[PDB]
Design a protein around this ligand. Sequence first.
Ligand SMILES: *C(/C=C/C)O[C@@H]1[C@H](O)[C@@H](COP(=O)(O)OP(=O)(O)OC[C@H]2O[C@@H](n3cnc4c(N)ncnc43)[C@H](O)[C@@H]2O)O[C@@H]1O
Lengths: 9, 224
Amino acid sequence: GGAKRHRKI
Amino acid sequence: KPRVLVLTGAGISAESGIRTFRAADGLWEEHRVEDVGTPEGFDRDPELVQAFYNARRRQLQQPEIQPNAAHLALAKLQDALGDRFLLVTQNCDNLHERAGNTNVIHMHGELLKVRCSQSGQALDWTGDVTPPLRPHVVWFGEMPLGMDEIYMALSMADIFIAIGTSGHVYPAAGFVHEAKLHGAHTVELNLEPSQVGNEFAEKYYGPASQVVPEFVEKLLKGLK
Ligand SMILES: *C(/C=C/C)O[C@@H]1[C@H](O)[C@@H](COP(=O)(O)OP(=O)(O)OC[C@H]2O[C@@H](n3cnc4c(N)ncnc43)[C@H](O)[C@@H]2O)O[C@@H]1O
């Protein structure tokens, strides 16, 4: 789960 | 009949005239995601962000924008499977609904809805947003919608199909792994191999308008 997040930080 | 869970992303609506995120950059409609796709972007320049989504909302409702063959095939799939079918989309468009699907889970929200930010209530909205209301759209750093029902369906699925999604954005990109953990057969249908394509047991590449009806037809005929 977790928040919507992109593979690069 | 098998329990089928379908995940869709922007690629299934590309051929319908809704342009996709160009991977070459970090830009959406010539905008940086940080500026139009984060809560922070909204706080710093609310009127630009409201204008950006006002534009997306209008473009969505233009006559030349319609469901394509891929959207239609998923409506036929739901017709055949009933409550053993669940469609989850990352898209904010309404093309699944216009194609005939029902109970579509919009885990990243909907362009045709806005949200009164004090409340949690989403409200139907088809026009511009003027002068605080915000788009009912899940931004980076925010929790996707409907996750409880999605993860339940992932644990129950006999077949998990991911369509038109690049595997960059979590948690959606992790659904294939979760499905595999609970024994589902996994299928990737996409223009090109995704970032997580290696996780899928079965895969077909090409434009969604061709690949999805082909796969759906093969699935439906294997039933009978
Ligand atoms: C947050 C906020 C939105 C307002 O979410 C959006 C989006 O929902 C999320 C996930 O992105 P995704 O839906 O996976 O889309 P892309 O990362 O842009 O990848 C597109 C995907 O589609 C394929 N594709 C393009 N064209 C086609 C056709 N004709 N047929 C099939 N597939 C196609 C590309 O090859 C990519 O794999 O991130 C955002 O923040």
